């Protein structure tokens, strides 16, 4: 078969690997997907960042992924706004402790404490909309 477009790192496998392509939904909106897969034995906390925070809905954008599990990130531009080839997305990932919390205040404290050399990052680029 065809190999899946997936970036592989030591914490997460990310699909697609580099280029984000947006499609049209039956509910009348543009939408792309970012699938994260935790390939470690511990919880991986992740955050999603973008160069155009005013343009895109990103859900989830500040959460965590259980070991062995996958998380789908739904990205959709707001109505009337167009996708730009300069729009980029940043995936920040860091491995959490064995008995670490995943609630809002625990995630805030984790990212305030984690040393920056243990934070893995991967960038994605948006492609212009085709229809």
């Amino acid at each position: 078969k065809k190999p899946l477009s997936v970036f592989k790192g030591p914490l997460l496998h990310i699909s697609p690997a580099e280029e984000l392509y947006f499609g049209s939904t039956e509910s009348g909106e543009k939408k792309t997907l970012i699938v994260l897969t935790n390939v470690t034995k511990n919880i991986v906390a992740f955050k999603v960042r973008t160069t155009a925070p005013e343009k895109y809905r990103v859900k989830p954008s500040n959460s965590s992924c259980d070991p062995g599990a996958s998380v789908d990130i739904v990205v959709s531009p707001h109505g009337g706004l167009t996708v730009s080839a300069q729009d980029r997305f940043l995936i920040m990932a860091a491995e959490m402790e064995q008995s670490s919390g995943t609630g809002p205040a625990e995630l805030t404290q984790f990212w305030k404490e984690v040393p920056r050399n243990k934070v893995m990052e991967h960038r994605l680029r948006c492609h212009t909309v085709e229809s």
């Binding site: 960042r49 155009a52 925070p53 895109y56 809905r57």
Partner: peptide, 8 residues
């Protein structure tokens, strides 16, 4: 050019 926190 820099990155900003995404919004749900």
């Amino acid at each position: 050019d820099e990155f900003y926190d995404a919004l749900s």
